[PDB]
Design a protein around this ligand. Structure first.
Ligand code: CL
Ligand code: CL
Ligand code: CL
Ligand code: CL
Ligand code: CL
Ligand code: CL
Ligand code: K
Ligand code: ZN
Ligand code: ZN
Lengths: 334, 33
């Protein structure tokens, strides 16, 4: 229903729109995001918003027409499900709120976030040399030290940080053997070729195809989590895959997957990304007013505050044993 | 068997099946270590 299947479709619509919009505005070869991390940090912040500030956040998050109660209860249920579905996979979903000591932050806002997001709430002195390492140290603690800094500086007039950290460490159901990894060429997006450590195995994997691409599903642990790989055919591009992705296309891939004997070649790879989502990406998705002096957050404080930055950092490492991935999203308010 | 040889750019996602949610998604145009 609306607070079940329909909200998952809207969240995956947010995932595809966030990927498409990020890809449009960044120039790097690699893109790696956690839409779950971004929407969780923004939904904590949304509990304080009123009027058009709240409407524009809900538009960007694909949550128009949902009440705060329903967004919070859905977020709480989703988090609980992800944390317990597979004890053989390591999953972390942590949330924290850091605010200026001595300022009054409304208790219903704090309690909603403690309840539905298990947010750790801390009143800190932003001028103390202890505060930046406490915040960055929390990020390191919640990402197995894969994201060790979310901030390089705290502006003098900082009011609050709302931070989410998603962590994943899975072991392939069918691991590659490092002794089968060989040096091989990989064609880069810029047309040059590089030599990589190409992992290899032959096994049963979920597989399907469509006009553009081949698709593979690689399970982890107890098969609750998996990796979907979209490999464009010769002459087809990843840009076209990204631009055509939506709930319908994703549903068609998932429903088309069949167990198939596959000769798989996959590079060992790692990437680390950093975004300032407030600059162009969230505004293009419809979030404008919350980044301006006309933002209204009466659920947080009586003072006029706004979102100055939405920092999103990610990490992923894929190897013969599995995958380790992490994301941190920090919403800065001043 | 079918060949699935990742020797050029690809899109990938990490999902969970009971909720259907996408935890991570991205594009790899360059392999780094
Ligand atoms: Cl439902
Ligand atoms: Cl979907
Ligand atoms: Cl919507
Ligand atoms: Cl630090
Ligand atoms: Cl910074
Ligand atoms: Cl950016
Ligand atoms: K940008
Ligand atoms: Zn709850
Ligand atoms: Zn390409």
């Amino acid at each position: 229903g609306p607070l079940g299947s329909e909200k998952i479709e809207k969240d995956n619509a947010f995932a595809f729109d966030l990927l498409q919009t990020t890809r449009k505005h960044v120039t790097e070869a690699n893109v790696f995001i956690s839409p779950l991390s971004v929407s969780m940090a923004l939904n904590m912040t949304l509990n304080g918003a009123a009027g058009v500030t709240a409407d524009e956040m809900k538009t960007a998050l694909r949550e128009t027409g949902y009440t705060m109660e329903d967004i919070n209860e859905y977020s709480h249920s989703l988090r609980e499900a992800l944390l317990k579905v597979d004890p053989s996979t390591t999953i972390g979903m942590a949330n924290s709120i850091w605010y200026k000591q001595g300022e009054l932050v409304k208790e219903p806002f704090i309690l909603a976030n403690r309840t539905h997001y298990d947010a750790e709430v801390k009143a800190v002195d932003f001028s103390s040399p202890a505060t930046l390492p406490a915040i960055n140290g929390w990020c390191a603690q919640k990402t197995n030290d894969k994201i060790t800094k979310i901030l390089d500086y705290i502006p003098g007039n900082a009011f609050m940080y709302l931070i989410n950290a998603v962590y994943f460490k899975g072991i392939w159901v069918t691991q590659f053997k490092k002794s089968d990894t060989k040096r091989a060429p990989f064609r880069k997006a810029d047309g040059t070729t590089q030599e990589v450590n190409m992992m290899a195995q032959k096994s049963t994997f979920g597989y399907t195809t469509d006009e553009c691409c081949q698709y593979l599903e690689m399970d982890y642990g107890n098969k609750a989590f998996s990796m979907i790989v979209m490999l464009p055919n010769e002459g087809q591009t990843t840009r076209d895959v990204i631009e055509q992705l939506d709930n319908k296309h994703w549903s068609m891939i998932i429903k088309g997957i069949r167990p198939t004997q596959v000769s798989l070649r996959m590079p060992r790879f790692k990437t680390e990304c950093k975004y300032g989502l407030e600059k162009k990406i969230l505004p293009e998705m419809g979030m404008n007013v919350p980044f301006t002096e006309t933002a209204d957050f009466p659920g947080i404080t009586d003072a006029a505050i706004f979102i100055s930055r939405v920092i999103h950092k990610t990490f992923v490492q894929v190897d013969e044993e599995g995958t380790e991935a992490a994301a941190v999203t920090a919403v800065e308010m001043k | 068997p079918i060949n699935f040889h990742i020797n050029k750019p690809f899109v990938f996602a990490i999902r969970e099946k009971s909720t259907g949610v996408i935890l991570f998604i991205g594009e790899i145009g360059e392999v780094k270590e």
